[PDB]
Amino acid sequence: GSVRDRVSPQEWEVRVKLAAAYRLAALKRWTDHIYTHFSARVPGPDEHFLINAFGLLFDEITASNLVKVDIDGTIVDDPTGLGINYAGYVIHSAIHAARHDLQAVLHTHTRDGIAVSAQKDGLLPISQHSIAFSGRVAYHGYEGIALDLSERERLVADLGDKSVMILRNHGLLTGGVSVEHAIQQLHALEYACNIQIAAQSAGNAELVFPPREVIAKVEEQAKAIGNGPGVARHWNALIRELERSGTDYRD
Amino acid sequence: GSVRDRVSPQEWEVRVKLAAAYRLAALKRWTDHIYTHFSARVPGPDEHFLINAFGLLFDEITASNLVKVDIDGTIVDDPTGLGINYAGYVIHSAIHAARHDLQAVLHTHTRDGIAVSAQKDGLLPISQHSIAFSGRVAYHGYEGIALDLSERERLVADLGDKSVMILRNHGLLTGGVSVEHAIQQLHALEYACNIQIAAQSAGNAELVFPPREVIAKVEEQAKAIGNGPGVARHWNALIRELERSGTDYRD
């Protein structure tokens, strides 16, 4: 294992975690073929980041084949020779630069995530799962495929201090203080969206909205919560489940 | 097998049944990662109960690794050293204490169960499967994640004499005189919800509601029915299907 021989032990553990995140997304079917990306900061004094190689499926990602790039997307270490999807990295770059606290940035294009993205009122407070996101979610209006400077500014302004964003007509974005934290938020958000699409099948007018005070209570209940013990527990079970398919991801 | 060596044969058989119930829910995809729980009373002179260890997936549960707790959730026998989700057990505790007849209490967070939970009119009488629940279903208004004393009282009052409850905006709850009885009711309810979400895709106004007399007839037809021979038959087939994936659940 030549990659693990030359990188810091701290970089290696993040390579393993980010690769597991790619494979988990594949297992949970949060994928859109070769498009969309998960990034993580390499711990250390350098503004370096890990992302998938250009054209590999989430299913193929390993600790060893992730690509290390700088804030601009310039290859620092590409064990594949495939490089990266330079245009797909811009959103990751914009967020990582603006928010040094976010060590991981996930973006997905799932059926139900995009579906919720495409609705005026976005994510509704109609389930325990969605209500837990009350006051945690940023929205960003759709501006096209490429993220120009004008939009990059608005994207950061829209996110503000939050770590979950719905990219309207586009999909979902989650940040975290770790890969584990980002993935826990993404997993929960994706489920909240699954449930919304079913719930609303007869129209939003059939929905029961719990009272504002109840929403507020759940907000307080969830406000006690990315370095908490609940993150590690959730993640460790995902890992045990993943390993059930073999351990290639961490080579 | 050290667990089976020290527990009563009656406790052991309930450990096996409750473990099968966890694995069946995993097979049928009634799961929400590591959240939600199934409990059973340990037969005997002690108010002791079995539940999953904190952080294990339904897929991992075995007769040997279930945790035995008292009515408060205090460990009596924890073969895993993981303890339990103390806060998740409160609903089980509230119901078991109030209703000594219910030997099993199941709670789920499925896509379609929560979806039906989230609708004003809840479960509609529009299919044989849903109509069979007519007059069997309690509703409980959503009050947040943690179940405080004020809500615990209302939860018991809402359930009354029934053994099926829709926890609005939250999910489904089933009780039974046995694990088998509880699981049969849950299986049927979950299917009734699947069917409702499809049925109503063009709006509730497109639905055919059979006449009241017909609903009443089905109520009488189902009123002949948790110690009946139909429970054992349904359960024994679930077991044969489960065993098709291996017999680890009963170790």
Next chain:
Amino acid sequence: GSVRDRVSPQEWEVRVKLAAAYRLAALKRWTDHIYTHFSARVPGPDEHFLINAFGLLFDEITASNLVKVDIDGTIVDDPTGLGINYAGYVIHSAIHAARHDLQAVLHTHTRDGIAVSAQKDGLLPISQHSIAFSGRVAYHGYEGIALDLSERERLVADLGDKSVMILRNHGLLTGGVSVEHAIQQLHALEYACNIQIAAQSAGNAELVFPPREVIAKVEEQAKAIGNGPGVARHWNALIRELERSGTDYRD
């Protein structure tokens, strides 16, 4: 193989075909656990019929374990000792007695079949798949679980000369001049329903209804069609696909 030793070669081939139909329904997920049933007439001078044993899953059915019953549901030959679901057989009995041309009667409780059943306008003419059923489909109003004499009469009157019925709020019924013919109609109907539930997700008012003449043309195009060469071709591919899972069904 003791069953095959004592039955006519003509009975044996229908046992094989009906068992394949049970397993195919399981493969295609047209099942409702241990409920619902497929029946076939045993060719010969006796009014005898084959059906699943009480409590077996569709997945478990074999040529050897099907049960032979008379028009009343009395066991003639039960290789399992499990008998039959006597109450579930009544619908099969009512139709087989009334329509000697129908050598097979299938009844299902699928998510989308029941969903379409539950709607005022039933199956809409909005896809090639649904339009092909125009003028082929009977409807029967829901009257409860048990089929009493009053309802048995109406069921036969409702079906009339047709061989496809939507049992409102209940599910789907298909007949055929053979198991192959019945299964082809059921497969097509189930797909037409899948498509309808998706199509109508924004309401029936968003639907494009092709002109009446076009519907009429498709009716004529499908009117050329249960002993045609298209039935055998469709069935033979289902069999090849089934055999991909092993050949236990025909033992």
Next chain:
Amino acid sequence: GSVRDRVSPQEWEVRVKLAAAYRLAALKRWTDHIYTHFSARVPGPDEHFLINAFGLLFDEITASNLVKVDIDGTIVDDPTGLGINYAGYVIHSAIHAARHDLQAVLHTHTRDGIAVSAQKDGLLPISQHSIAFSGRVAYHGYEGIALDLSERERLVADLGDKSVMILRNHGLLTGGVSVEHAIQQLHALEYACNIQIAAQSAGNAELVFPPREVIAKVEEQAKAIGNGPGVARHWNALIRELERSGTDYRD
């Protein structure tokens, strides 16, 4: 391998590609049993085309068993002796004759493709995936199963210069300058439809439509795009994924 011994290396590579396209559609569940078809032009001085043999599943198709036919559907080389679905080939023939640039023509009958087909406003501009098709999509009104001369003319007129068509109440059609190009467009269109059906579950009135300028921008962004490097990358990943199930398709 007798087929590969007698055909040009250029024909052989298209046989391999078209077979992979059939198996991929099976893997991605874009199938309707034995109905629907993918065609490709055989490179060379002859107006010859490849299509599946009559009655084989997409899952069974191999480079060796594809059938070579002329523009009329007359067998030129049928390694199976099964011939072709002559009536199913007419749409392929009509398009291939009219548009010599299209080396591949795909037609599908998927749940969500037909569903979108069945709606007045067809494919809505409410997601990145659908907006990318803005101004690329032809519509053709439904006229029945058989494609007569009057309809053949209208079908070609409706398609015009485009290479993507929604066959209203019927399903989807994609063309391409290669099998790879056609498949990339089909994959994207099918996903756009999946997302639309979810998005619109509470009605089209809940949808956010990005402004016209934003749609226009995406049109320009996608207008840079069937011989581009993005086609090969998308296709090569599909192939790697397919090969994960074995390499029978290319024998």
